[PDB]
Amino acid sequence: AXXXXXXXXXX
Amino acid sequence: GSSRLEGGSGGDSEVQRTMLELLNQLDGFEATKNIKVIMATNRIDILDSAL
Amino acid sequence: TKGPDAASKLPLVTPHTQCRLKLLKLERIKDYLLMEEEFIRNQEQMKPEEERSKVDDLRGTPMSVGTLEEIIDDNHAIVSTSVGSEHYVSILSFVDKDLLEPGCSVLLNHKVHAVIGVLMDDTDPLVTVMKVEKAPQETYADIGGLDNQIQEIKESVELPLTHPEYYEEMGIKPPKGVILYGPPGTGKTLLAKAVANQTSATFLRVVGSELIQKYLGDGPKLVRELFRVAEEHAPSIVFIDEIDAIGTKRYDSNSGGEREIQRTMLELLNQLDGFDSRGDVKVIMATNRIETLDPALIRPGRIDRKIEFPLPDEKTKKRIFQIHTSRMTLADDVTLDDLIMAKDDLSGADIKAICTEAGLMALRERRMKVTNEDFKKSKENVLYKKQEGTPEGLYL
Amino acid sequence: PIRALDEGDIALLKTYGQSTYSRQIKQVEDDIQQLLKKINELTGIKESDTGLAPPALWDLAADKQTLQSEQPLQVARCTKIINADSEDPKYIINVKQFAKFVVDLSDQVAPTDIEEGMRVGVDRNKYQIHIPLPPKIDPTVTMMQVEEKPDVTYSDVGGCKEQIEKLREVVETPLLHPERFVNLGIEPPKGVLLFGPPGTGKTLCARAVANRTDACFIRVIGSELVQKYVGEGARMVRELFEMARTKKACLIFFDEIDAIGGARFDDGAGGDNEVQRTMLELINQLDNIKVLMATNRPDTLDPALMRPGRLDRKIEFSLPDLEGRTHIFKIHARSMSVERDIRFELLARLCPNSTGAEIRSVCTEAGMFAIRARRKIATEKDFLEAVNKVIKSYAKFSATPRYMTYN
Amino acid sequence: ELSEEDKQLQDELEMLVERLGEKDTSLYRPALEELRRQIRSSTTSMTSVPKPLKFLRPHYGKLKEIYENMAPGENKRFAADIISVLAMTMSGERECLKYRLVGSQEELASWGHEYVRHLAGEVAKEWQELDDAEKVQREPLLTLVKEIVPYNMAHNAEHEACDLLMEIEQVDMLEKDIDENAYAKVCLYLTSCVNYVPEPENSALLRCALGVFRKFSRFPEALRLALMLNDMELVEDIFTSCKDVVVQKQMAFMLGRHGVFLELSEDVEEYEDLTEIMSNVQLNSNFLALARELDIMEPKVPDDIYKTHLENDSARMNLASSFVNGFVNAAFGQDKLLTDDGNKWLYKNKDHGMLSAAASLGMILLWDVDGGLTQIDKYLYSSEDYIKSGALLACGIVNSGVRNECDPALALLSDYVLHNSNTMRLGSIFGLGLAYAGSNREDVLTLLLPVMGDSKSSMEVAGVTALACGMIAVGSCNGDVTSTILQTIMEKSETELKDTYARWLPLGLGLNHLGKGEAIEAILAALEVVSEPFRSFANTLVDVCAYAGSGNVLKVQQLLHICSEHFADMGAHQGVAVLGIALIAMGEEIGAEMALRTFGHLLRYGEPTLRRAVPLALALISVSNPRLNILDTLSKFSHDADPEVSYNSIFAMGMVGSGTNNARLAAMLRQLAQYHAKDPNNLFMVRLAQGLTHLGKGTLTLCPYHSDRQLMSQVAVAGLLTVLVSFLDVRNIILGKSHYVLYGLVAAMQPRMLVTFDEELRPLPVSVRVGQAVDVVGQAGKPKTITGFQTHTTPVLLAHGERAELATEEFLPVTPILEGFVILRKNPNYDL
Amino acid sequence: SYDRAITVFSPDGHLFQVEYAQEAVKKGSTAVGVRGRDIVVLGVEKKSVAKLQDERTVRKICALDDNVCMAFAGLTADARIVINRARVECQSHRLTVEDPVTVEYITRYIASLKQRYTQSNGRRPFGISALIVGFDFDGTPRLYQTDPSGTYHAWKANAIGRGAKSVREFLEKNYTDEAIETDDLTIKLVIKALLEVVQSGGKNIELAVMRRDQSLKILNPEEIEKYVAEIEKEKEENE
Ligand SMILES: Nc1ncnc2c1ncn2[C@@H]1O[C@H](COP(=O)(O)OP(=O)(O)OP(=O)(O)O)[C@@H](O)[C@H]1O
Ligand SMILES: Nc1ncnc2c1ncn2[C@@H]1O[C@H](COP(=O)(O)OP(=O)(O)OP(=O)(O)O)[C@@H](O)[C@H]1O
Ligand SMILES: [Mg+2]
Ligand SMILES: [Mg+2]
């Protein structure tokens, strides 16, 4: 359910 | 370094990829010379068996 | 094809009992090494221009490195500066209009941008550290047991390079890609460290977490680079240890970060068996959990042999002991069978802790000779983190 | 009572009992290591030549001239033509990253040579359009097209005759005989999305279509369509499709569509939407150009991209039936040194629910059993030993103690 | 801190040390007795830190001086033992040793294993520090080594036991203390240590380790060492001492495999069988015998080897065609091109082409003075009688590697060695050298004597002539032959030297001096007369031949210097120099593998002349040994721009893969052929490399090492040296008029097989677990010397670096090292 | 997800619950059954007492009837309940038909008892793989092995529990007509067979032998020790 999310970085 | 959960929607997958690094750094393809680790925890059953 | 840039291993000195046979053999290695240094140093000293010097003057200093994008005329090409701009620079004579290829990294004059040199071998520092130079020091004789597992891992990464005739004389294509899986501490990485100390082919290594960069394309582009170097360097083995970090089961993730890791698995899944088939680049994955890898990344064709490493059996555990108690000094009363026979699931990494501990329990009593009690005590002191978990006396 | 090692204790432990060669030998090993370290550094720097041409093909006298007279020209694009009076045009040029400038031509160029939209070269100083430039041929996209035809023929793709026939009526037949699809007026499906369990023949039925193409086959990597800089993913999608319409009879094969075909979801707080806008630039693009796609996991594809307005046809590559597995076997064993007699039909029923690849490893392992033991003929007994390791060894548990229920 | 036991022990020792302050009568005898007990009790215990030594940190100055005054008798000596034992923990060696030297004797065993060894080191340390200036100190130290050495023999410390004696420079006593359960451990150790040990100790070790093999009647083992020292006398004794004929028979088969011939007195029973075995007449029957089991009797053709089908008639390539139909089908007894239509085949070779093709006729049929000599009846007398040298090499080549009682080589060749035509003589002297290589026969050596002085002989006749004499007296330093060579070499004039073929004259000098670096000091002295460059060149090359396989880092350091120098008359000295390192270092694996690194450095940091020799140098290091690292190294220079490097690298590949049938080397060789298809010089030798890589369909090896790679084959090292140095100038020598020189290898051509026979010589197929050999030195018990086991049903083939062990205890081989032909004696112990 | 019910077939026609059920049998103590000419021996290993509990309440080998003994593996709770039903079945059939039960029938009933529990949900299978051995066949010795699945099988020799793979492999290669030819020889085989006990203690092996028209005889820990000794004495021929 509750979902922790990572993230990238468009330069 | 809590036990590695099955990759899915909800499951630690980035603290895992850094666990699989420390796991390899300490005893991996490249041996380490003169580095020692003193991890301190409270629950000892919730760590992954590789650690 | 630069050829296999195999590791650089100094010959091995055995006896290990610290006998004069050992000193002499180390001296011989040293003697030639002292001699070899002599030639290198005495070659610069004993060793005490008008064509290249003109070239270096046209280039000047420094020289930028951008990506070629189009060879407009024979003497004109469009080169993209290191920032992503474009430039209609001029192609000078000294450059080779042959090595100049779209996508090649071109050396550019700094003042008046003009192609001046083609920079081959521009492999990232992030993949040029992946190459193993100093070969690990654990030979196949340091790995005890695992004769069925070793042979399986020696018929995909060693034999297919020494006796190729057997395979091509029979119609097989040498198995290429082996998934070393098993419980933690069984010897997965040691067998890998042993193929590097025997192989004669470039042994690239990764850790399954190195090839996940933060940038959107940094990830899939490092994998496309690693399998470009491994292919470039001819016979090669790429060891992606702890493959579970990148290749876990694909899923509809509502998180962009996790959709870039999978966009890196779906690159390692196509840099192995997809259009434009591979060359000679074997892959040795390792993982303690084969039950979470994507059914495709371990689908026969990419990982042909799934070597399974069970916890040591009683005969192997007895051989594992000696390989780690070879250099030790056991007293006459050290009959190892007392510890081996136990039904405790003593892994192969447990055995080397029951050896480090039983040798440190010797310093406690001021002894460099470990008696039989030094193992009994050590077995308990080294056997935690697994306690005792099982069913009650239900089953008879 | 773990008494700490007193300094008096340490001195004895390290000297009492020492083998008289210990200090010397350990010295020799330590000497070597440092010696090896020094050895590399004196030679570790290996010259990396920088691609200079042979001395004969130099014009160093003229080379100084090109660097001196000729000047670097920034490559730009004319986005509009104001045509101030039709006599002083005042072109507007884009320097890509630098800025947008309203520039005027250097006298060398002709006013009529610079047509709106064409790539135009400018001067670093004033940005006057010195020279027209050929339209952009992408360095990556251009390499994408399969210049060397894959060697796998259609006779190597076994057990998928109805799936190959279904593909040949969308990727080959409407491209070689555009007369059966016109008489009935049926619009040829301009794309198929091959899906199936991993290792059933998706990319082999892809290389096979390439060996008999007669077209321009473009192998879309999937990786290159996800670039760091924003937008450069879509810019590549256009520059691929644009490179197709220019060609006649072009086929595009997006292997592993999952890479850039994930189901959309708002994640704007991150670069993921960069990839998504690259798909929406592909959904617009898709909806003589046929498109193929392979996806071992179709369920992760956007419902929009699987509609019958973009992917008109969806070929399912199922696990082979028995009459096909005995055919997938013979295809991979036609070059093996097998004994004439092998009951391949028998080996098809021992590999139930087995894919088109695990049949291949049964043939590859069969020999490895014939190589382990020095027999140059891979007999039948080897294969059953092969099917035990390739298929059965990883199929399920289903073992004797729990299998004495089936008879 | 301490405890009640520890702190009290500190006081109890403290009281004892303190009580020696005065001269009380009940302070010296009482106290020293206590220290004797406590120190003895702890030291003669487990490795426990000797609490007496840790508590006892006192000064001996008070007791050392009073030692003299206090009862110089027993009371004096007692103090010495207590101080001596306390010395081993501390650093007072000179005093620590001399206390047991002068103090109470008692016995070494009473103190402790740790103490004994420490006295061992100091005794060796003192003995080394004691020169011949005085033996007065030596008698005591020598007495100590009398007792201690037996201490190690019992305590599994033979390593220290052998180590202890070697330190003293004197290792005789091992003869008297080795037990039936120890000779294997001691004998193996010395054989392993002997190679590394420098002159002259290494020589002394070989005889001593040889001696130990004597005391326990292990005769075949004594054979291997006897040859290692390369001294025939000790061989003759063992020949004489072997009252068992069977051991006599076997030790002849090892004597033969080495190419060593000792005139057998008729008193020795079965002289003909021993003579026939030593003469190597029985070799042909086995070789053909081996073929029939292996099913390789069918001859091959060049076209199949090259595989023209896969790749995408000049006289030269015909030679490469002629050669490949040599080596490849050589010794098989039948060729499909050179035996049926040969007149047709050769006729398309112009002069030197005829020479090469005719010679291969003899090499196609080796070890058959009848079949080959009868396969030697359709060409030699050719209308272009120039090819007579061709069959003369074939005539001589057939006799190479064997000795017939009828002396065919001298008979046929002698009548034409004086033949006026220059070409006719080239085959005569060269072929003769191959036939009697290492024979050292005075007649042939004498008959070859006038060839040197025959002025009418052309230089090419001369260069082969000196080489021919050298190959006959290889490794014997024959005074007559050396004199002839030494006398002949001096008379050479300066202008005539400048030619390439004069490069062969010094070669003959060394080949006489292979394996004896003590006697080469003089030979280098005599050569100093001649003027440079060839004075320096001969000096280096003669220097190399002296130290063939010595493992002398000193000469290698000397040799490396010459290569290191950066100078045309200096480059010939360099080129022989790099090949020098290859020959010297190629005895031990540890050094030999290291020479590769040095070879590699000489190529990246080398110069024109050096870069040509390095590809040849690697050839000697790993002949018939497809080590991937070396084979790869030759390839990456197999395309090099300099024609000489490209050829030499290609030839090296052929040598390294000689007889190995390495598929990778073949595939590597085939690809090169396509790359160099344009250049005939490269294509000729790349085609040649494929020829060497199939020597005897792989059923032969040119490796100069037998007996677990331990027993050197002197005659062999002569051959490879001729071609390798002769390759130092390929274009004049190889690419020039001297294609025949490649037949120089035939001297070392030997078979590699695992045919097991019953006790009656019937092939006894015995399961033989054969795999990579693993050293048993320093491994306690019955270590497995074979790894990567792959049970083969003998006969079997052993690629170089492999050893075969009789997996069935049914039989007990007479000779421990299962190489070549071994007499399997049925085990009396085995019970069905 | 096809393993959380007993009557739900997996995609490949597998009753996974029954397959899981035979996992309990692999987790009991090794029970070997070898049938001889006049004494059908069946042994139990891993006796593994607790040092403070009497072993009478541990019995694992039970005589279903006067002529048929039953040594089980698997989980104890169910083993007692199956034996009680079988004991009642052996007597009940005797009353219904005068002739006493045969070994095969009781096995058929036991297999009939288990099967009706694995056929329907809301009832868990007996997790015991019992070795049914008995001379009641009235002339021919006969030993069967059941299966928590519900299939009964006849073996001339068996091995159930933790180590069936090891015992069974070692049993085929040592069972012959020569071996069974003698009664004391027959028992020597099982003692040798179970001598591959997890720790090979030699003291935790319990063999029970029943003979033609005889009565069951739980070997006393003096005859077994003698047989364990005698077998050891016979094994002493290795040197
Ligand atoms: N069979 C074996 N023989 C000898 N040593 C062994 C064996 N198995 C494990 N070891 C020892 O285990 C040590 C470390 O274990 P290893 O690196 O092989 O584990 P791994 O497979 O990488 O584990 P993980 O799953 O944690 O990555 C090695 O130093 C080696 O000595
Ligand atoms: N049905 C089949 N018939 C013949 N060969 C097959 C078949 N399935 C797999 N193979 C073999 O496997 C190779 C690649 O398998 P395949 O093309 O199915 O991969 P894939 O479907 O792309 O896998 P993924 O979807 O995980 O990328 C083929 O080139 C062929 O050698
Ligand atoms: Mg690991
Ligand atoms: Mg694909």
For residues E621 and E581, what is the distance between their CA atoms, to the nearest angstrom?
Answer: 9
Chain C to chain F Cβ contacts (< 8 Å): 24
- CA distances (Å), origin F92, targets D205, F82, F115, F146: 68, 15, 20, 21
For residues E392 and D269, what is the distance between their CA atoms, to the nearest angstrom?
Answer: 90
Q: Is the peptide bond before E795 cis (omega within 30 degrees of 0)?
A: yes
Q: Hey, what long-range contacts does D30-35 have (CB within 8 A, 24 or more apart)?
A: D31/C30, D32/C10, D32/C26, D32/C29, D32/C30, D32/C33, D35/C30, D35/C33, D35/C34, D35/C37
Residue with tokens 């120099």: E577
Q: Which of D305, D356, D348, D343 is nearest to D326 (CA)?
A: D348
For residues F176 and F181, what is the distance between their CA atoms, to the nearest angstrom?
Answer: 9
The alpha carbon of C190 and the centre of ligand 1 are apart by a number of angstroms equal to: 5
Structure tokens at F38: 């006049």
CA distance between the termini of chain D:
66
Cβ-Cβ contacts under 8 Å for F161 (sequence gap 6 or more): F25, F26, F27, F28, F29, F30, F31, F45, F46, F73, F129
Q: Is the peptide bond before C125 cis (omega within 30 degrees of 0)?
A: no
Q: Quote the crossing angle between the two packed helices E245-257 and E271-279, to the nearest 10°.
A: 20
Cβ-Cβ contacts under 8 Å for D400 (sequence gap 6 or more): none
Are the beta carbons of E159 and C19 separated by less than 8 Å? yes
Count other Cβ atoms within 10 Å, centred on residue D265: 16
As a dihedral over the C-alpha atoms of residue B9, residue B15, residue B20, residue B25, rounded to 10 degrees, the angle is: 170
- Bridge partners for D100 per DSSP: D94
Q: Which residues of E touch D46 (CB under 8 A)?
A: 604
List pocket residues of ligand 1, CB cut-off 6 Å: B 27, 50; C 143-146, 184-190, 288, 320, 323, 348-349, 352
What is chain B's length? Answer: 51
Cβ-Cβ contacts under 8 Å for D109 (sequence gap 6 or more): D129, D130, D131, D132
Q: Which of F200, F190, F196, F211 is nearest to F42 (CA)?
A: F190
Structure tokens at E204: 């002394």
Mutation to probe ligand 2, out of D161, D167, D194, D204 (largest number of atoms < 8 A from CB): D204
Chain breaks in chain C (C to N over 2.5 A) after: 48
Are the beta carbons of C172 and D371 separated by less than 8 Å? yes
As a dihedral over the C-alpha atoms of residue C110, residue C115, residue C119, residue C123, rounded to 10 degrees, the angle is: 80
Q: Which residues of C touch E196 (CB under 8 A)?
A: 21, 24-25, 27-28
F36: helix, coil or strand?
coil
For residues E705 and E589, what is the distance between their CA atoms, to the nearest angstrom?
Answer: 12
- State the pairing for strand pair D119-123/C76-80: unpaired
DSSP state of E321: H
For residues D329 and D347, what is the distance between their CA atoms, to the nearest angstrom?
Answer: 9
Q: Tell me the Ramachandran region of residue E401: left when phi exceeds 0, alpha when psi lies from -120 to 50, beta otherwise.
A: left
- CA distances (Å), origin E752, targets C41, E221, E696: 43, 21, 10
For residues D401 and D398, what is the distance between their CA atoms, to the nearest angstrom?
Answer: 8
- State the pairing for strand pair E824-826/E705-706: unpaired
C115: helix, coil or strand?
strand
For residues D312 and D293, what is the distance between their CA atoms, to the nearest angstrom?
Answer: 12
Structure tokens at C244: 């579970």
**Residue ID of nearest Cα to ligand 1 atom 16:** C187
Q: Which of F101, F105, F161, F102 is nearest to F131 (CA)?
A: F161
Count other Cβ atoms within 10 Å, centred on residue C314: 11
For residues E171 and E177, what is the distance between their CA atoms, to the nearest angstrom?
Answer: 11
User: F4 is in which domain, residue-wise?
Assistant: 1-239
Q: Hey, what long-range contacts does E453-456 have (CB within 8 A, 24 or more apart)?
A: E453/E488, E454/E418, E456/E420
DSSP of D156-207, one letter per residue?
G--S-HHHHHHHIIIIIHHHH-TTHHHHS-PPPP-EEEEE-STTSSTTHHHH
Cβ-Cβ contacts under 8 Å for E58 (sequence gap 6 or more): E17, E86
Structure tokens at C123: 């492999």
**Residue ID of nearest Cα to ligand 2 atom 16:** D201
In terms of Cβ atoms closer than 10 Å to its own Cβ (0-12, 13-18, 19+), residue E327 is buried
Any idea what the CATH number is for the domain that residue F154 is in?
3.60.20.10
Q: Are F103 and F152 in contact (CB under 8 A)?
A: no
Side chain identity at D398, as an amino acid letter? S
- Bridge partners for F142 per DSSP: F134
CA distance between the termini of chain F:
56
Report phi then psi at E89, rounded to 5: -65, -40
Nearest beta carbon to residue C35 from set E46, E560, E636: E560
CA pseudo-torsion sign E59, E62, E64, E67 = negative
Domain count, chain F: 1
For residues E482 and E488, what is the distance between their CA atoms, to the nearest angstrom?
Answer: 9
- State the pairing for strand pair C178-181/C90-91: unpaired
What is the b/e burial string over E380-412, where b = at least 16 CB atoms within 10 angstroms of the residue's CB? Answer: bebeeebbbbbbbbbbbbbbbbbbbeebbbbeb
- Bridge partners for F160 per DSSP: F31
CA pseudo-torsion sign C349, C350, C353, C359 = negative
Report phi then psi at E561, rounded to 5: -60, -45
Residue with tokens 């135009």: D120
Q: Are F31 and F131 in contact (CB under 8 A)?
A: yes
The alpha carbon of D203 and the centre of ligand 2 are apart by a number of angstroms equal to: 6
Cβ-Cβ contacts under 8 Å for C348 (sequence gap 6 or more): C185, C186, C187, C190, C311, C312, C317, C320
Q: Which residues of B touch C193 (CB under 8 A)?
A: 29
Report phi then psi at F214, rounded to 5: -100, -170
CB contact, 8 Å: C396 with chain F? yes
D233 in contact with ligand 2, CB cutoff 6 A: no
The Cβ-side half-sphere exposure at E54, using a 13 Å CA radius, reads 24
C244: helix, coil or strand?
helix
DSSP state of C305: B
D81: helix, coil or strand?
strand
- Bridge partners for F75 per DSSP: C395
Mutation to probe ligand 2, out of D193, D202, D364 (largest number of atoms < 8 A from CB): D202
- CA distances (Å), origin E761, targets E285, E368, E424, E619, E757: 12, 21, 43, 37, 5
Q: Which residues of A touch C254 (CB under 8 A)?
A: 3, 5
What is chain F's length? Answer: 239
Q: Which of F156, F134, F103, F107 is nearest to F39 (CA)?
A: F134
DSSP state of E341: S
For residues D380 and E226, what is the distance between their CA atoms, to the nearest angstrom?
Answer: 54
Q: Which of F166, F168, F147 is nearest to F156 (CA)?
A: F168
DSSP of D211-275, one letter per residue?
HT-SSEEEEE-SSTTS-SSTTHHHHHHHHHHHHHHHSSSEEEEEESGGGG-BPP----SSTHHHH
CB contact, 8 Å: C255 with chain A? yes
Structure tokens at E486: 């030494």
Cβ-Cβ contacts under 8 Å for E263 (sequence gap 6 or more): none
CA pseudo-torsion sign D24, D30, D36, D42 = negative
Q: Is D44 annotated as a binding residue?
A: no
Q: Which of E642, E639, E649 is nearest to E618 (CA)?
A: E649
What technique determined this structure? Answer: cryo-EM
Are the beta carbons of C343 and F29 separated by less than 8 Å? no
Count other Cβ atoms within 10 Å, centred on residue A6: 19
Q: Are B4 and C289 in contact (CB under 8 A)?
A: yes
Cβ-Cβ contacts under 8 Å for D20 (sequence gap 6 or more): E117, E118, E120, E121, E124
Q: Quote the crossing angle between the two packed helices E504-511 and E479-491, to the nearest 10°.
A: 160
For residues E291 and E700, what is the distance between their CA atoms, to the nearest angstrom?
Answer: 12
Nearest-Cα residue of chain D relative to residue E598: D39
| R_g (Cα) of chain C, nearest Å | 27
For residues E325 and E363, what is the distance between their CA atoms, to the nearest angstrom?
Answer: 10
| R_g (Cα) of chain E, nearest Å | 32
Structure tokens at E186: 């001691």
DSSP state of E43: H
Chains that touch A (3 or more CB pairs under 8 A): B, C, D
Q: Which residues of C touch E593 (CB under 8 A)?
A: 11
SS (H, E, C) E639-667: CCCCHHHHHHHHHHHHHHCCCCCCHHHHH
Secondary element (H or E) of residue B25: helix B14-26
Q: Are C190 and C317 in contact (CB under 8 A)?
A: no
Q: Which of F175, F195, F72 is nearest to F133 (CA)?
A: F72
Are the beta carbons of D398 and F164 separated by less than 8 Å? no
Q: Which of F74, F130, F137 is nearest to F101 (CA)?
A: F137
DSSP state of C137: S
Q: Are C58 and C116 in contact (CB under 8 A)?
A: yes
Count other Cβ atoms within 10 Å, centred on residue E763: 16
Q: Are F69 and F208 in contact (CB under 8 A)?
A: yes
**Residue ID of nearest Cα to ligand 1 atom 25:** C184
Q: Are E48 and C365 in contact (CB under 8 A)?
A: yes
Q: Are E330 and E319 in contact (CB under 8 A)?
A: no
Q: Are F65 and F134 in contact (CB under 8 A)?
A: yes
Q: Are C192 and C237 in contact (CB under 8 A)?
A: no
As a dihedral over the C-alpha atoms of residue E722, residue E723, residue E724, residue E725, rounded to 10 degrees, the angle is: 50
- Bridge partners for E711 per DSSP: E706
Side chain identity at F223, as an amino acid letter? E
- CA distances (Å), origin F207, targets F49, F103, F191, F202, F236: 16, 19, 7, 12, 21
Report phi then psi at E246, rounded to 5: -60, -50
CA pseudo-torsion sign E773, E778, E779, E780 = positive
In terms of Cβ atoms closer than 10 Å to its own Cβ (0-12, 13-18, 19+), residue E679 is middle
For residues E9 and D397, what is the distance between their CA atoms, to the nearest angstrom?
Answer: 67
Cβ-Cβ contacts under 8 Å for C13 (sequence gap 6 or more): C22, C25, C26, C29, E590
For residues E410 and E424, what is the distance between their CA atoms, to the nearest angstrom?
Answer: 15
CA pseudo-torsion sign E178, E179, E185, E191 = positive
Nearest-Cα residue of chain D relative to residue E51: D9
- Bridge partners for E773 per DSSP: E786
Chain breaks in chain E (C to N over 2.5 A) after: 312, 567, 570
DSSP state of E191: H
D198 in contact with ligand 2, CB cutoff 6 A: yes
Q: Are E210 and E226 in contact (CB under 8 A)?
A: yes
Resolution of this entry in Å? 3.5
Are the beta carbons of C242 and B8 separated by less than 8 Å? no
